[PDB]
Amino acid sequence: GSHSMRYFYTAMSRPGRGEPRFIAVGYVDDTQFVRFDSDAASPRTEPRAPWIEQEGPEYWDRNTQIFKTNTQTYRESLRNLRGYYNQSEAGSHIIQRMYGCDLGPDGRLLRGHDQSAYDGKDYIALNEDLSSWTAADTAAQITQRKWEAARVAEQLRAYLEGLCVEWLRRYLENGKETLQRADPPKTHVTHHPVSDHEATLRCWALGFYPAEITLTWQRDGEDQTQDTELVETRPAGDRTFQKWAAVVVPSGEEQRYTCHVQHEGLPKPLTLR
Amino acid sequence: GVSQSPRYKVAKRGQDVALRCDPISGHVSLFWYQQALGQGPEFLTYFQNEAQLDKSGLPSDRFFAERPEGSVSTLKIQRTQQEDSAVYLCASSPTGGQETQYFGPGTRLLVLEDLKNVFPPEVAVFEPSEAEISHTQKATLVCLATGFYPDHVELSWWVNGKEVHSGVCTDPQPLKEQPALNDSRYALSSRLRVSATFWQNPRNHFRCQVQFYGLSENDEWTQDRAKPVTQIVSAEAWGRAD
Amino acid sequence: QSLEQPSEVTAVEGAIVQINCTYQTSGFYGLSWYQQHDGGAPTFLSYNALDGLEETGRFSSFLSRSDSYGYLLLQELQMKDSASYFCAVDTGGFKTIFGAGTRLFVKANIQNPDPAVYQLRDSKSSDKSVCLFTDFDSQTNVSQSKDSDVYITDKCVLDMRSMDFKSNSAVAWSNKSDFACANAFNNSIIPEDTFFAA
């Protein structure tokens, strides 16, 4: 797919530090556009992207209302989950939720999704049919029964297919100058000043948006996992990201190797030696 | 189900009123609605447990809603005005908004300038016609509840100590006794139809009961006539063989 | 952010009735139906979140989100179905918008009409006298009296469940000596075959 809209929720209990904290964050791809934090004295939804600032005070009061409601809902949910697991008021617990809509290159709905976790572990997730739930345990089965009586799946499917897609298209249009613009990486091969028999080959990529990239090192055949140092895609501070790949060569016959890139911002994949 | 108290209330302009709601146990969501004559319920306030999340529908700051323990809720109206006269409905939902709503029977509140014209009903039973019995082999008893103000009554028929609904039909709306008067007293009629053989048995007891909602003991009364308190007024009849 | 439904609808016992509800909103979440008897609690009938048909016994409700409408269909109508029917729109959050309501009137099918005006008496007749117009067909209309001293009630249908018998009736009364059964319902268009005993 080309573009996606996602909302990230965190509800955290904290004995001795006040009432449970609720944080809600909205993203269009890798760009944050909305933030709500219940920890403020008078909490309200905040704009986090320039293209969202144009939205009227009605949009902001509607966002503030559901996030104020969710603060209260998740407080009760943490209390109910403590009960299902026979946990006392002593410990700190976290409920996490991630939901959203994925649009294909055509700009149509490819995938609608929703997943919830408890203490960093899968709890309840909406199925691919968007009509049923997968409950990870017996506690999540009690949540499922409540959510079935409340008609959550029907109203969530309708939102994911309708309003989610509709509003993501509005955001993509309003933010077209920064969101529908994909920057390509600056590629180069290097080698660090090492000692004897400690030589290595390092492939680099340094300036890109989106973060999706594929760096592979193969020339004669296909080594794959066989001695290929993979590094996690690390951010820069704007929209920029970074990534590198390595292969061991403790002697001197390294012209027989080739690095390959796959970023979508480039016209076609590059070959590096 | 959801319960509400009082069922009816007559209040004097300027006096304070307290409306009670007892929702279904375990229900997280609580709603308060106002219902005007010939209209749908209009949103007043919303609760999830003890937290009042919204009160945008309240008509004045004189209105105050509470649910301190996240169960029973109160809707208090300070210095009541005639415009506050409506049916106040409370509802509950199991786990949040956009769900099935379970309503209470409501409180029918009427605010008047004063309580000088408040009257309990006079109840009378009218025995069936011998002409009806001979022609249809059925006997209709008629009950008349007259001279009551305001229109805050509940009529019931009791046959041999048990409340009956079969063969019973009461007017949906009462009539005004003095249509020229703005504070006109009311009259309400009800019919109970039994078989001729049932009315002919002298062991059968028929009672028309009218529960009237008026003044309480807290209310002051210095007028010559008896205090128009909340009371039951009845009229009875026994079977007639003739 | 509104919805519309008919003010009133009249149907006969045993027949079917459809109440249509059109809404206007930018963020629809659900359409639901509630039945409210006079001075009673609104009671849940059905809920439509997605497009389709909800079937619960004799009642059913449909939804078409693209056409912004839904309807409630009541089948095999009974006397107990006479009430107000409210359609309700959910638009996200918790604040539900209810329609003005549709009052349904179910007319009783009177198989054997026997129109008659009878006279009833009290235990202590130091007050007034009662006249009862009964057993007329549901098409018969009852109007108010010309006299300011004569009170006439509206009609209502009683059901003698054990005998499977239903009958319409109207009550007339006055304290005046001029008042009689023969003149009691003169302002109304009563059947030609109306029985009058003396």
């Binding site: 009760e76 989950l81 949540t143 409540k146 939102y159 | 949040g96 908004g97 | -």
Partner: peptide
Amino acid sequence: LPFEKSTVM
């Protein structure tokens, strides 16, 4: 725009 149905677990 977020999901506008908040349901207790």
